[PDB]
From a paper:
The V-Csn structure was solved in two crystal forms; apo1 containing a single molecule in the asymmetric unit, and apo2 containing a dimer in the asymmetric unit. The apo2 crystal form was solved by molecular replacement using the refined apo1 structure as the search model, and refined with phenix.refine. The apo2 structure has two independent V-Csn molecules in the asymmetric unit and the two molecules form a non-crystallographic dimer. Superposition of the two molecules of the apo2 dimer onto the apo1 structure gives a root-mean-squared deviation (RMSD) of 0.45 Å for both molecules. In the apo1 crystal form, the same dimer is observed albeit generated by the crystallographic symmetry of the C2 space group. This is consistent with the observation that V-Csn exists as a dimer in solution based on size exclusion chromatography, although there is no evidence that dimerization is required for enzyme activity. Formation of the dimer buries 1830 Å2 (∼9%) of the surface per monomer. The regions of contact involve the loop between β-strands β4 and β5 (in Domain-2) in one molecule slotting between helices α3 and α4 in the second molecule, linked via hydrogen bonding and hydrophobic interactions with residues from the two helices and strand β8.
Author numbering:
A (entry chain A), B (entry chain B): 2 to 224
Write the structure that this text describes.
């Protein structure tokens, strides 16, 4: 077999794929990561996700995004997409923008991105590209490794990636627990922030060199 | 008396203001410029503005945004805010993104920006900052010179700037022709693209040095 187990998370095996470019693959469900969307979090459950999923916004521990000097979530400004909403962070970021800016983070609503579990990146660096495939519908999309999830879970990506895969994109009730999504990651492919046009083109180039979606469909029968 | 006429458009006198930092001021209505908003234009009147307001989207003269090699408007991709909508352009732009990207242009929905009439920039360069004041309500906001309008009209700005001034922000039916908006432009203040946090902070410093909003309110009685 061209596939060799390199890792396993929550019952999902991750396989190294023989050949160039270097890649690994796994079949999992698809939870919705709204992190980075500028409407994900707001006071009093005003966002698309529950405020409490970012922590305590009243001077306790807030982990959902950047905080001020007193530990309160940053509120978006009049020049930000959703004034008064909190700034939701992703692990991948655009260095052009300050820590307190929604523009620093990857907008889950518009950018197809995958989540990898913490300590299970398997050599991938934030910004690396991937091909993502819904085996139930045939839908597929290129994506970046854009966020880090719990080390104990696997199979998660952005609101826009869900839309592209025809998976329910609602942050509260969406996603699927059915293991219908095949993710092919290209570790070492980018490793930095770049424009979506640039990384999408690169994902296309790597996928063609790797053997295309047709090869992924063939390999997916082993998963 | 601190004001000296430097220009006139559509019956609106534009005045330089004595002292540093250099500035000019005018009192005008506020038309809505949806250019740069990624939902402004789409085929078949799908955008927030009428498609015809961008020109001819059937291979003819299209001024609404970039076109392909055949002359038809560029459509947004799966990694753009509104896939399938046209790319709407502003005169001011972010050089980090390609001509065909909505991210290159100033998103009217989120960025407070003013329009100056073509051939009537009066020394201002795109990216320069301004203080904008609704004399009827007292609302005010800093903004950038973001787009170029018809040479025969004056008083126009972005959807977000309308929101900040509590003026109807609808691209089709909004804005006002009542001369209630006082715009104080700082020519030579920035003259390039930079993050909103940077230019907004600089506008705040220039306004402090210039004498604050209270000075603009007093000067507005001469307009």
């Amino acid at each position: 077999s061209e596939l060799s187990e390199i890792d396993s998370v929550a019952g999902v095996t991750i396989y190294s794929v023989d050949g160039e470019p270097k890649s690994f693959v796994y079949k999992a469900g698809f939870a919705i990561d709204a992190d980075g969307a500028p409407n994900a979090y707001a006071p009093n459950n005003g966002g698309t996700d529950f405020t409490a999923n970012g922590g305590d916004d009243q001077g306790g521990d807030w982990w959902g995004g950047p905080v001020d000097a007193e530990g309160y979530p940053i509120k978006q400004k009049i020049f930000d997409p959703f004034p008064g909403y909190y700034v939701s962070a992703t692990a991948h970021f655009n260095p052009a923008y300050s820590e307190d800016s929604p523009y620093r983070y990857i907008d889950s609503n518009s950018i197809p991105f995958i989540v990898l579990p913490g300590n299970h990146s398997n050599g991938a660096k934030l910004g690396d590209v991937a091909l993502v495939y819904n085996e139930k519908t045939g839908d597929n999309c290129y994506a970046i490794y854009g966020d880090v999830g719990p080390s104990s879970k696997i199979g998660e990506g952005s609101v826009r990636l869900a839309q592209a895969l025809k998976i329910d994109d609602n942050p509260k009730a969406g996603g699927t627990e059915s293991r219908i999504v095949v993710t092919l990651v290209f570790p070492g492919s980018v490793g930095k922030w770049e424009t979506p046009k640039r990384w999408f083109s690169h994902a296309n180039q790597l996928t063609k060199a790797w053997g295309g979606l047709s090869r992924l469909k063939t390999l997916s029968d082993q998963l």
